[model samples]
Target: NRVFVIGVGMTKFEKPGARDIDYPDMAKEAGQRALADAGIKYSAIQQACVGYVYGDSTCGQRAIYHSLGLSGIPIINVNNNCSTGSTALFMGRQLIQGGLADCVLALGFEKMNPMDKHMEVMINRYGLAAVPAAPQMFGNAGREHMEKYGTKPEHFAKVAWKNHKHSTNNPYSQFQDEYSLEQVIDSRKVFEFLTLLQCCPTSDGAGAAVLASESFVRRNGLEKKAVEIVAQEMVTDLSTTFEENSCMKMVGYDMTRLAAERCYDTAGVKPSDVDVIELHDCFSANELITYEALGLCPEGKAGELIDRGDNTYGGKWVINPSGGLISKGHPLGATGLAQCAELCWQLRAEAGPRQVPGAKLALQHNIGLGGAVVVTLYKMGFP
Candidate 1:
């Protein structure tokens, strides 16, 4: 049985300190919206998968309990770092594909304001910290790209500027102000060639999506446009020796290429067919590198693509109409699911100002700190 998405919902991403929202509140709101969109009753859901990165233990159960007043539906706690939410969705998809359940709910929520300092002690306990910490992973990746290819600082700035511009049209985005290349590059330096504005800010939010088998959708008279999940692929690569291999490094991608390959194959589509994308833009550099990793262009062409304004809102395959993490803020666990939400909206032609024209095919990609990558493909046409 192929998996199909029935509904998707997400709250606006906002700075942790600026918003008075909590994880449970955000989760409940997103879940309610998803249920409403799917036109399903709460009792129809057999299981719930909540992707939470920094939340406390039993966070999944906590979220479900908060939303439904009961938690006996086998809530699974998923923590795959940055890919937590999307991974959770993958799990939900598998459950239905395997005939384990008829319907499943996947939710991701995070408040990224206060990171637990004790995480260091836990890492040391596992002998994971071998090198000093690199405060800015974005700068490291940017520097590497520049060294390998004659990528200019202004090129990365173009990514930031473009995302900000697209995000300004997104009401749920954390940042709505667009920036010029000069403004992006001239912003305060967080790392070499990486400005503060080029990086994503911590945010609090939640996103949810419903997955059901195709038979279920047909039986329920659901809109075919809303019932598409062509493929779901997740890859993990922790063996790479990149800067992300350093204990102090907060980002790395060992399997992003593998994830992309599998997802594209599973979807029966090529990179060229992707009309829009919702990617992890935790940093402008990540977004740039992703273009190459996803086979959108040749290696080192991401900088050029951005410089030419080909990835902007009106350009080829508008990358992030939700503003991405750069403009929408990264709410840890919720980021990936939020990307899914963004994709659903674009694919359904429901995205208002940030809509991608003729966005029939779409992809959502998410990466984790330790090299976990999850990629999903969706199409508007019925399978």
Candidate 2:
């Protein structure tokens, strides 16, 4: 049995508390849209995998009950820091792959606050007194890259500028206003070379996907929208995470590299075959580091890749076509599924203005610190 994402949906990513929306409301919007997109009812889902970081136990049942229905299905809850959403997707796929269920739903939502225990851990471990933990960790990684590769601050700023510019075309992006390179560089500093524009803002939103076995898709006449999950792999922290004592390693760089290698190997694909990508860009620095980690380019050559105009439209790959986390908004639990939704849309030729022309192969990378990284490959099921 093989798994396919037959439908996907997501609410517009927004600033925390921006709209008085609750988890149930967000979940309903995303789940209902996914169901409608799949042309099915709540009765079709046999199991549900729901992801959230801040919610209490059984919030998955509470969320699904509101709009999806109360059919007594097994509702599993998941929380893997920032990668929670994809973890849910991974679980759902496994259920179908194992023939445990023909149809399953993967959903994620987050209502973020000012701070959390994750930040405290990073702050205490790194001794980052008052500076924001996220920017400090990622900023330190960028500084190391600069020192080793002669990458300039302007290069990091350019990544943000590109994402913001790309966001202007994304209706679901939280921040759609495009910024110039100068503005990105001059924006309020978060830590080191990371300006406000370079970091993902705390966001509130929900995203959902409907996964089914190949037989289920064929039975439901959903081949047109079915996107095959070619390969999916998740990697956790390695010994080097602490052994290296480098901020880059501490933040899951090695995990990302290992996970990506396994995914490409499993799918029998290479970086050149990928037409588009939706990678974790919690910070611009992570995006740059990931280009290497994902084998898009050689290590320490991210700067040259950026210089070649290979990361944007008309480039080798249009990375983060959703404006990435920087502009797309990072609702901890929803980010990964949102990436999944975007890639599905691209493969189906439904991504409107942000569509990558002739994109048949797509890759997704979502990472969380503590830590886990999920890398997935996608292609049209029938194509």
Candidate 3:
């Protein structure tokens, strides 16, 4: 009646076209690595789900049909904008938890190319600044937070500062350079207070995880490395997102709040029980707002939480010890599963230098902005 992630793997995320690698090969690297980590053959997997934001209909299958295995199992294709990767994870977990499959693989890959590219003090000015839709959307959310709670621009910049420092320890992170709080705030501004360093970059990468039921874990003698999914909930958009006219809610505040609340209830734990986390930090502002959305702090208290260093090392919780989407690069489809891989490593005490010492409970938050948020809780299954 329980589902656990037994193995996880990912390729280093890099700027688009930085390498000659293609999608299939990227997926193969992560997929094979996951199976090897699990000490299982591809034959053990009963089904698969892949995430992709580009390409035509069966790109998911094309990426996995033969590379992972020739096993004629059902391969579902998933795409949910920024949330695509976690949707694949959602599907994999559901299949195992429902007893439909004992072992399932969830993978996501993005081979992105470069270039190609909110509402503002509620709308007009930043909108006229010619900012890309993403920064406008998220920056406005950040802008709104500042207006409502007296959250300073430095509070958001500090989130980027911590995540960038966290990246120095992660070889798989796309950016490893650390910057001081002053340097971070002084970086070339993007939209309003959202600086260039605060935004996620395009990435070419892949990530994979093998999920199994408790029975499968026992059958395979995987107790030592198994990380149980204590609870997971996927919440999509609600009327409040559009009707309330709150940009924070529009970008996924309500979705994350509701989904995280459900996950905690189902897991019989609270935010205080989480020792480490990998949330969607697509933008620095997103991280600050999500601190409240995830219940890491009370509403309008995220700035205080940031000032006290509660969101980083030596704090009450270590959020995004993996460097997060900001430093790890957001390769759309790959981002969510990469979060999974990082947290799995953290829970197993295998994150190397980036490991949060004494970490036990882990939480994941990935939101797709035309709406959908998946919140997951994890802990060592055999410990």
Candidate 4:
């Protein structure tokens, strides 16, 4: 009873006020592309897991009922802060893995949402009032790294530079123009050590995936395109999240480490085996700290990885070839599925231009501050 992603689709990530479409229209377009990609009708899906944040209680019901035509399928609403879409994907995989369904659909969309609750938690914990919440939380973590490891601020700017450069080839990326190291640092500073180019913009978009059991894939002759989820794990706030009194732990460094370890073990893979990656680059600082957390290198040595030319193109692995959230834009719930889609493309040799050369295995990471993280590994089923 193995589960596979038979098809995937997504809208171009865009700025908040750039679009006039509602959630239903957004949901419909992504779902339609997924269905077309799968070459199946909507009636084949047995269940739906829809995710959204900053919306009404029954967004799942309304989103599916409006455009897809309600067929009395059980539609579960999922909200796990920034990890909502990843959570929904996890639930859909579960149903097929458990033999409860032959086919399932996972969809995520976000028009916009408020951050007051997260802002309040920031104010209570770190004592911030006039600054934006995200940068302060992750920026403080970067400041800690600078003090303890002597990592230069330009190291973080380098991450932004690599991702932005990678984005020039991605048509779906929110910001495609590449930036120089000096430009990335000189751009308007959002918080200490973090500039405007280092931060991800809020987006309005949607993404979808169609999952099926091995039996269903064979029946539908989808083995050629099927990408198996080798291992996936969701880890939430560890006790150290609050007890450590460390900004790094507070922003989900520990959760990502824990989840990635479990996923790597479950998949019988090592960090060296992975050929490409799509990790959450909500901020350049998080991306750098997570390199060590995800066991990409030893603790406190991510700066060396950057200097060794091991994080991009000719390196050990090409991280975030889709330009990552920093360039693609973060549509809250849609971000995780978007990450999933990118990895699936990489494994199938379908990611043109931005393709990682002869990629065989792909890794994905997405985290939310409220706090949760979903780490996943993938490879083609037939390959």
Q: What lDDT score goes with residue 203 in model 2? A: 73
Worst 10 residues of 2 by lDDT: 122-131
Model 4 residue 190 distance off true place after TM-score fit, in angstroms:
1.0
RMSD of 3: 4.4
After TM-score superposition, the amount by which residue 258's alpha carbon in candidate 1 deviates from its true location, in angstroms, is 1.6
TM-score of each model, in listed order: 0.88, 0.92, 0.92, 0.92
**Winner by lDDT:** 2
lDDT of each: 0.76, 0.85, 0.84, 0.84
Worst 10 residues of 3 by lDDT: 122-131
Q: Which residue pairs in candidate 4 have backbone atoms (N, alpha carbon, C) closer than 3 angstroms, thus clashing?
A: none
Error of 2 at 371 (Å): 2.0
What digit string (tens of lDDT, one per residue) describes model 4 on residues 1-383?
A: 78899999888888776878998889888888888888888899999988777777788889888757978999987764334334678889888999899999999888863565655554334322123566778989999999999899999999999999999988877789988899999987667888878888777889999999999999988998899999988887677434556988888888898899999999999999999989988889999999998899998899999988799999998999989888888887788888888888888888898888899999989764355788889999888
Model 1's alpha-carbon lDDT is 0.76
Tens digit of per-residue lDDT, candidate 2, span 44-155: 8999999887867878889999967677899888764334334789889999999899999999888764544655554344322123566767888999888988889888
Which portions of model 1 miss their true places by more than 4 Å? Answer: 80-86, 112-135, 238-254, 381-383
Query: Which structure is stronger by lDDT: 1 or 4?
Result: 4
